[PDB]
DNA sequence: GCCATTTTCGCGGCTATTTTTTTACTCCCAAAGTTCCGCTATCAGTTAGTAAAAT
C-alpha cells in the first residue's frame, strides 16, 4: 500500500531520493531515505536547565 | 555444655527539576512585674551672628 501510494504521487517506490551537498553541490554517492516525520518538542528545554 | 534454632540489627546507586499544612480547647480573682506615654533636664552638636584679621 505504501509503494502504491508513492507511485500515485509520482515518487520513487523505494522512498529514497538523490540528495546533493549544499556546501559543494556534489551528489551523495547513495540514495537517501527522505520523507516526513511527526516530531515533537518535549518539555526539556535548555533554558530551564542551564 | 555444646549444636541448633529463633530473634534482633542493619543494609539496600548518583546527579538534576517540579512543590508548605489541616482533630482534640473552663473560668475568675487577687497580686505582681512590666510597658508606654508624657515630662524633665543635661549635654553635645549645629547654626547664626559679630568682631578680628587680612587683603
Written description of the protein model:
By secondary structure, the chain is low in regular secondary structure. The chain has one helix and two strands. The protein has one helix spanning 2-8; strands spanning 16-17, 32-33. Strands 1-2 form a two-stranded antiparallel sheet. The longest helix is centred in the first third of the chain and has 7 residues, at 2-8. It is flat and about 45 Å long. The termini are far apart. The protein binds one DNA strand of 55 nucleotides through loops.
In short:
The PDB classes it as transcription. This protein has about 50 residues and is mostly loops.
Q: Care to count the β-strands?
A: 2
DSSP strand content? 5-15%
The main pleated sheet reads as:
2 strands, antiparallel
Strand order of the largest sheet: 1-2
Number of helices: 1
What is the CA-atom radius of gyration, in angstroms? 17 Å
**Can you give the helix content as a percent range?**
10-25%
Oligomer: part of a larger assembly
Family: Belongs to the RNA polymerase beta chain family.
Subunit structure: The RNAP catalytic core consists of 2 alpha, 1 beta, 1 beta' and 1 omega subunit. When a sigma factor is associated with the core the holoenzyme is formed, which can initiate transcription.
Function: DNA-dependent RNA polymerase catalyzes the transcription of DNA into RNA using the four ribonucleoside triphosphates as substrates.
Protein name: DNA-directed RNA polymerase subunit beta
Which helices and strands, and how do they pair?
Layout: H1 2-8, E1 16-17, E2 32-33
Antiparallel strand pairs: 1-2
The structure holds one DNA strand of 55 nucleotides.
Family: Belongs to the RNA polymerase beta chain family.
Protein name: DNA-directed RNA polymerase subunit beta
Subunit structure: The RNAP catalytic core consists of 2 alpha, 1 beta, 1 beta' and 1 omega subunit. When a sigma factor is associated with the core the holoenzyme is formed, which can initiate transcription.
Amino acid at each position: 500500500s505504501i509503494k502504491a501510494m508513492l507511485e500515485l504521487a509520482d515518487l520513487p517506490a523505494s522512498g529514497q531520493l538523490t540528495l546533493f551537498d549544499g556546501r559543494t553541490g556534489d551528489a551523495f554517492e547513495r540514495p537517501v531515505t527522505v520523507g516526513y516525520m511527526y516530531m515533537l518538542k518535549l518539555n526539556h528545554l535548555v533554558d530551564d536547565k542551564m
